[PDB]
Amino acid sequence: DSQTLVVKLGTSVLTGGSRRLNRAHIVELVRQCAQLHAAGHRIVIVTSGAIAAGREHLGYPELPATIASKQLLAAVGQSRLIQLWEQLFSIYGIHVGQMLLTRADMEDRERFLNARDTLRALLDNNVVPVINENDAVATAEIKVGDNDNLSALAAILAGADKLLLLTDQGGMSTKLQAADVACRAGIDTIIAAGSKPGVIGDVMEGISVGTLFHAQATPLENRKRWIFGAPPAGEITVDEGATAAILERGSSLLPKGIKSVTGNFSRGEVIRICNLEGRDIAHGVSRYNSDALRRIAGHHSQEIDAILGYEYGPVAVHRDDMITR
Amino acid sequence: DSQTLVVKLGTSVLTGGSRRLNRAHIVELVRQCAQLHAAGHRIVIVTSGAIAAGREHLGYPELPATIASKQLLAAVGQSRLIQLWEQLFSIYGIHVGQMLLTRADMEDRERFLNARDTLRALLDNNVVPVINENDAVATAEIKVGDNDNLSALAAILAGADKLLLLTDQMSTKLQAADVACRAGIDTIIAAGSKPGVIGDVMEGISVGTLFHAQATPLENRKRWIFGAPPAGEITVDEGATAAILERGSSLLPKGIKSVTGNFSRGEVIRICNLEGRDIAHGVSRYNSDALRRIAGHHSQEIDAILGYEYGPVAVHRDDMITR
Numbered sequence: 345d346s347q348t349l350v351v352k353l354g355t356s357v358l359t360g361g362s363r364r365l366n367r368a369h370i371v372e373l374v375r376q377c378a379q380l381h382a383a384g385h386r387i388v389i390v391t392s393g394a395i396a397a398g399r400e401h402l403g404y405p406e407l408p409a410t411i412a413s414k415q416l417l418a419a420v421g422q423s424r425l426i427q428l429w430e431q432l433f434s435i436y437g438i439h440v441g442q443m444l445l446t447r448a449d450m451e452d453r454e455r456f457l458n459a460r461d462t463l464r465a466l467l468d469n470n471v472v473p474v475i476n477e478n479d480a481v482a483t484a485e486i487k488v489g490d491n492d493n494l495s496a497l498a499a500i501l502a503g504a505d506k507l508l509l510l511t512d513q514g515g516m517s518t519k520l521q522a523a524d525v526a527c528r529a530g531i532d533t534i535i536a537a538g539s540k541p542g543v544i545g546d547v548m549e550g551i552s553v554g555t556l557f558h559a560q561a562t563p564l565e566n567r568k569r570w571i572f573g574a575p576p577a578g579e580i581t582v583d584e585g586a587t588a589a590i591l592e593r594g595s596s597l598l599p600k601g602i603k604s605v606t607g608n609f610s611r612g613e614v615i616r617i618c619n620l621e622g623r624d625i626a627h628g629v630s631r632y633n634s635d636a637l638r639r640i641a642g643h644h645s646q647e648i649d650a651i652l653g654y655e656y657g658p659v660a661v662h663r664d665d666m667i668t669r
Numbered sequence: 670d671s672q673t674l675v676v677k678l679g680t681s682v683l684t685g686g687s688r689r690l691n692r693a694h695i696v697e698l699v700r701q702c703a704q705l706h707a708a709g710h711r712i713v714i715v716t717s718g719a720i721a722a723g724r725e726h727l728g729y730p731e732l733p734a735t736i737a738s739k740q741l742l743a744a745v746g747q748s749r750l751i752q753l754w755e756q757l758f759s760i761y762g763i764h765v766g767q768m769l770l771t772r773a774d775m776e777d778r779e780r781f782l783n784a785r786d787t788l789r790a791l792l793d794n795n796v797v798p799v800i801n802e803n804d805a806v807a808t809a810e811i812k813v814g815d816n817d818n819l820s821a822l823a824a825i826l827a828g829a830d831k832l833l834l835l836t837d838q839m840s841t842k843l844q845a846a847d848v849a850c851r852a853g854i855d856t857i858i859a860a861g862s863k864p865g866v867i868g869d870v871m872e873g874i875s876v877g878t879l880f881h882a883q884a885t886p887l888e889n890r891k892r893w894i895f896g897a898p899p900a901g902e903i904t905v906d907e908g909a910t911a912a913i914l915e916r917g918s919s920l921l922p923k924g925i926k927s928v929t930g931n932f933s934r935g936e937v938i939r940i941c942n943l944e945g946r947d948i949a950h951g952v953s954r955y956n957s958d959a960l961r962r963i964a965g966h967h968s969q970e971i972d973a974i975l976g977y978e979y980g981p982v983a984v985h986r987d988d989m990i991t992r
């Protein structure tokens with residue numbers, strides 16, 4: 345009976361479409377979560393609003409149009425944001441815990457497992473995790489970049505049964521991607537209006553509300569779900585045949601099919617695979633250092649030993665360490 | 670004339686040696702900072718106490734002695750902690766900004782500079798950065814591992830003139846003073862319970878122990894290397910150890926004896942002597958497999974061995990910090 349639900353609240357949900365966090369709207373969504381919590385369910389919050397909270401608290405100041413500006417606002421806003429969640433949940437006797445992360449914290453199976461553990465330890469002790477991107481401390485390069493996608497990753501981390509993406513009803517687009525990442529990991533996804541009375545309870549019960557996305561009948565293997573989180577450390581461009589081999593046959597990537605290789609990356613790191621078109625067709629763990637791949641690109645499997653002076657098997661990226669599409 | 674001070678407050682300072690954060694002791698220290706802030710000075714806080722705040726807030730629950738327990742405590746505790754710093758600084762009309770980080774945020778020049786700019790943007794706008802390790806989201810492998818060392822890095826990031834390590838009155842404190850002192854930052858170790866200690870340190874009044882900034886500091890372009898977590902290691906000749914330590918020379922592949930791990934060109938690595946001691950960290954010019962392949966060989970052979978070449982040196986003196 346007990347279930348794990350991730351609720352994602354983006355900025356216009358939190359502000360009610362104004363330039364200020366709306367505590368009336370938020371406390372009403374907290375009340376709904378509390379009700380499910382009191383009933384034995386596990387609740388995870390993914391929250392936006394750090395920058396809006398900061399802008400408000402500093403009195404809307406003139407700032408250089410720079411990333412430093414946004415990060416300074418998030419440093420201030422995130423302080424205020426977590427307070428707001430803490431105070432509001434405390435009305436209902438519920439404790440919260442702050443987690444701030446980026447793709448960097450999922451560049452490994454190990455760092456992914458670490459984040460998973462923290463989050464499950466929170467839920468196991470009846471604390472609600474309040475998750476957001478670590479905006480104050482991050483380069484654009486390591487960020488998830490939108491909270492829709494982040495909440496899917498959080499759903500995976502939490503071993504969630506459902507993901508609820510609240511809307512204030514491009515914005516639709518990240519939501520569809522999130523629904524896709526989540527469903528493939530075996531998690532039901534619902535897009536629904538934050539302003540709909542009893543929305544969160546309805547979703548939890550199974551009452552048709554918002555837009556339903558069924559979890560994949562047979563989900564992507566648990567052991568490789570962490571690859572969804574990793575930021576690709578470089579990109580590999582690949583054959584017409586290799587492309588087909590990966591998308592149709594679900595096969596591994598042979599260096600025979602590699603056309604080019606961009607970036608510096610090591611064996612063990614996750615990289616992006618592109619077709620000649622330029623489209624991202626897969627992410628997967630590299631078996632070879634990047635200087636070694638440029639070297640064995642185009643050559644058959646039996647040749648690797650002799651080109652490099654060593655081998656780490658015949659495959660550039662193994663299907664078991666790969667996520668297509 | 671206006672200055673930049675980093676104040677580090679560990680757990681026993683914030684609790685006054687009990688298991689609860691002491692709001693009385695803390696507001697007094699905040700008052701001292703605020704007085705310096707109002708006079709034009711730039712104040713940065715490096716705070717411990719997330720775990721202690723967490724246990725108290727949860728009512729001292731019985732938790733498994735695991736790292737996930739510590740991480741849950743930090744997740745709850747950091748939240749309480751940032752709230753306490755904000756509430757108290759606001760007494761004085763001062764805003765705070767939360768920054769949580771690990772060595773990962775300093776594994777790179779770019780990520781290092783990104784944090785630098787954020788911390789300095791906070792200060793230019795009179796906001797006090799409240800800095801801590803990201804204990805809720807981090808593996809052991811990527812943490813600084815102690816807030817003494819963390820504050821030395823924070824001082825570097827901030828372009829601090831002084832670092833003040835507050836005590837409940839040691840080795841991690843001496844380590845942090847070394848890092849700061851080398852980066853040209855005066856480090857003071859002194860008792861947090863000393864009346865006017867923060868204000869006194871700013872005025873240069875003798876309180877506790879002062880460690881002087883290095884007469885000629887480590888070059889600024891390479892200070893970020895104190896921050897990085899080594900991505901792998903190299904073990905090195907008796908000859909190469911001596912060239913590095915005694916004559917500050919670059920590292921040539923000839924003296925490389927072994928290579929540990931998987932890493933790329935551009936990543937910081939650790940250099941070990943044969944006895945196993947850490948003697949320098951420096952940016953690798955070659956990937957780890959390439960290094961295994963050219964270890965013990967002359968620079969002339971690199972191109973012929975690898976099929977390419979990035980200069981005669983495995984780790985340049987310019988991208989290296991010894992010790």
Ligand SMILES: N[C@@H](CCC(=O)OP(=O)(O)O)C(=O)O
Nearest residue numbers: 354355392477489490491492
């Ligand atoms: N951290 C994100 C913003 C958060 C976010 O995207 O929230 P949403 O777009 O789901 O309202 C960024 O890249 O600035």
Ligand SMILES: N[C@@H](CCC(=O)OP(=O)(O)O)C(=O)O
Nearest residue numbers: 679680717802814815816817
């Ligand atoms: N929070 C950090 C460091 C805390 C710390 O050691 O500071 P201390 O209380 O020793 O001055 C951690 O990773 O344990």
Ligand SMILES: O=C1CC[C@@H](C(=O)O)N1
Nearest residue numbers: 355391392393394395396
């Ligand atoms: O749109 C926004 C407001 C705050 C920031 C965040 O991710 O918290 N993004």
Ligand SMILES: O=C1CC[C@@H](C(=O)O)N1
Nearest residue numbers: 680716717718719720721
């Ligand atoms: O000793 C402690 C208290 C909490 C944690 C921290 O430094 O935040 N370490």
Ligand SMILES: [Mg+2]
Nearest residue numbers: 678679835836
């Ligand atoms: Mg201390």
